[PDB]
Amino acid sequence: WDTKTMSQVANNMVDVIPMEFTDFIVIQTIRDAVVNILIHFDRNFYQKMKVGVNPRSPGYFIDGLRALVKLVTAKYQDLQENQRFVNV
């Protein structure tokens, strides 16, 4: 999967926007920074761990993205619940 294609898929995955706040170091979008982190980690993972004459291709990337969405939604819900409790 070409890095451009990976970024396209990651951008269409995090179209849900539970997150907020700035990019301290200048595109300059939050989700773009997150997907760049994920892409670089996928590349470094395939570079460091797996031994072999370059046969494999990113499959952990998709599952990681989906699990990240799931977990972020759960965490936003729980955090709002806690904040509401303490506010009342």
Binding site: W1, K4, T5, Q8, V9, N12, R56, S57, P58
Partner: protein
């Protein structure tokens, strides 16, 4: 070159206005071939194996795209030849270095035998020929194909197996390749998707 010039003559009975361009198209097709077998040999990959059968496939693809295509201008003809040359020679290539090598080789061949300034981006991502949208096999716009694929993929996801995925730039070109493969009579094709690329889907 002589045999395939005769082939190009025989297929250019559908567009006699370019009867003078029957020879340069053959030589170029041969020159491309002569280079494609030289640069990409069995030393690089086990499947870099070319033959006159590829030239026959190229002529056949040119004829198939003309016989069910609108009136072809010189630009349309050379871009059609380029599309089929890509689909026959370069789809089997591996890595990126070698794909750019073939792209520049196509540019060199065209510059050698077809002197024209009407060319655009000859890369496989810019020229797209599909019989899906148009009634005929015609070069269409990018955004048109993207929207068409999205709207058809929604229904394909609702009727058949439910699978969410992201339509990206490479998916369109690969879908076009699979379409031109499944359209011809004796359609057979093997995909080397390492995994999760969704060759199956």
């Amino acid at each position: 070159s002589q045999i395939y010039e005769i082939y190009y003559k025989a297929i250019f009975k559908l567009v006699p206005e370019f009867r003078s361009y029957t020879e340069p198209f053959a030589r170029a097709s041969v020159h491309l071939y002569n280079e494609c077998k030289a640069r990409y040999s069995t030393g690089l990959q086990s499947h870099y194996l070319f033959s006159p059968r590829e030239l026959t496939r190229l002529v056949r693809g040119v004829y198939t795209a003309i016989n069910t295509g609108p009136r072809q201008t010189l630009r349309s003809l050379i871009r059609l030849w380029a599309y089929e040359a890509w689909r026959i020679f370069a789809d089997r290539l591996v890595g990126v270095k070698e794909k750019n090598s073939f792209e520049q080789l196509l540019y060199e061949t065209v510059d050698k035998y077809l002197p024209n300034q009407d060319l655009g981006n000859i890369s496989s991502t810019s020229l797209l020929f599909s019989g899906l949208l148009s009634l005929d096999f015609k070069e269409v716009n990018k955004t048109d194909l993207v929207n068409f694929i999205e709207e058809r993929f929604k229904t394909f996801c609702d009727e058949e197996l439910e699978v969410p995925m992201v339509i990206h730039e490479s998916m369109v070109d690969h879908i076009l390749r699979i379409d031109r493969a499944l359209k011809q009579v004796q359609g057979h094709m093997m995909l080397i998707g390492a995994s999760r690329t969704g060759k199956t889907i």
